Write a protein that binds this ligand. Structure first.
Ligand SMILES: CN(C)[C@@H]1C(O)=C(C#N)C(=O)[C@@]2(O)C(=O)C[C@@H]([C@]3(C)OC(=O)c4c(O)ccc(Cl)c43)C[C@@H]12
Ligand SMILES: CN(C)[C@@H]1C(O)=C(C#N)C(=O)[C@@]2(O)C(=O)C[C@@H]([C@]3(C)OC(=O)c4c(O)ccc(Cl)c43)C[C@@H]12
Ligand SMILES: [Cl-]
Ligand SMILES: [Cl-]
Ligand SMILES: [Cl-]
Ligand SMILES: [Cl-]
Lengths: 194, 194
């Protein structure tokens, strides 16, 4: 079939949904595209090259809320961006693990830059603004990884039914809010003992 | 060599530090112990059985702060427990990924139970107390996974030097505090609009 970057990646993502990250190989990607292994190598050198490309494309394709709207508060921005990141990671099987394994990308670097400007304009230092964006990312990554992996005593028994009744979204959205408020309390305090 | 559970796991953890999770196989575990593959199978049926056992032992061995001290506040407990969890996950190469892949364990279930009682005594519902413990865990897991994987424009350039100067600990400890305060603000509010 056709072997430009876009088609290769469409085929690799679709293969990702069939096999998961551990299962995904170039040899099976070559089968799906109706081509021999050495043809594929011209286009994609190894699994690691494939996964880096996949990590960037999952976000380009689906991480739709990467930038603040006109007028938007920093709280609201961190919320919408976390929700969008989460959703993009959930869209493909082992999506979170595909993301974790990769350093960020020339275009992802101008987006995070704009975010860091945004947070500085709203009164964060570079430091505290970086800590805020990192905490959000790490919390989200961790929640999604746990959700994607999974799928007694009393209190637990009831506990692990309120966590199962849902796919993890409620637990995530509540913790998101706790995190944002915690940042707000940090920020608002300036140099007072908080 | 000697093949009781303790020695097998000591050898598997030491092998873990040489190869990482993707590299670790029963066949290499058998080599390290000076035994043939079918001897090992009697003791450990597969990689998945090995990893589940490893996940439980990393925590038994090193997650020293699993329970509150006499008198301790819930804030302080969540802090010390997060720090302890983080440290135990960092102690072995791919430690976080070994943990993520496993459901919890008969003894881990009585510990989380005691935690959930602890949070209820200090005024959390089961729900909100579960959300708090989960958020802490997910944040910590995500921070550690990112730290273990890793090892331009201006603001970033300065950003990714304050994140590198350290191993991730400062970013983690700051976000930890933001999370705990966020919970405190939730809890204290009761039914008022917060
Ligand atoms: C979820 N958002 C908060 C961010 C985002 O919109 C991204 C996009 N597109 C990311 O890559 C993110 O989701 C993301 O995972 C990266 C993350 C960040 C701060 O940017 C970095 O350059 C960087 C780094 O070099 C090491 C660790 C971390 Cl947390 C980062 C920025 C994230
Ligand atoms: C870091 N601590 C906060 C906890 C802890 O002390 C543990 C131990 N030992 C865990 O297993 C923890 O670190 C941990 O990872 C588990 C986690 C929890 C709530 O307990 C569960 O039974 C459970 C579950 O079934 C699904 C998701 C989650 Cl987050 C959980 C409890 C964690
Ligand atoms: Cl074609
Ligand atoms: Cl072509
Ligand atoms: Cl011996
Ligand atoms: Cl023996």
């Amino acid at each position: 079939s056709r072997l430009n970057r876009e088609s290769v990646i469409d085929a690799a993502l679709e293969l990702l949904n069939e096999t998961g990250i551990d299962g995904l190989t170039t040899r099976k990607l070559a089968q799906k595209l109706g081509i021999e292994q050495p043809t594929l190598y011209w286009h994609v050198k190894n699994k690691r090259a494939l996964l880096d490309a996949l990590a960037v494309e999952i976000l380009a394709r689906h991480h739709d809320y990467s930038l603040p709207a006109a007028g938007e508060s920093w709280q609201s921005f961190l919320r919408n961006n976390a929700m969008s990141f989460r959703r993009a990671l959930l869209r493909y099987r082992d999506g979170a693990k595909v993301h974790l394994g990769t350093r960020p990308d020339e275009k992802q670097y101008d987006t995070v830059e704009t975010q860091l400007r945004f947070m500085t304009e709203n009164g964060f230092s570079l430091r505290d603004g970086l800590y805020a964006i990192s905490a959000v990312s790490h919390f989200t990554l961790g929640a999604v990884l746990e959700q994607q992996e999974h799928t007694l005593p009393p209190l637990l028994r009831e506990a692990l039914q309120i966590m199962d009744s849902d796919d993890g979204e409620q637990a995530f959205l509540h913790g998101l809010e706790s995190l944002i408020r915690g940042f707000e309390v940090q920020l608002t305090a300036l140099l007072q003992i908080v």
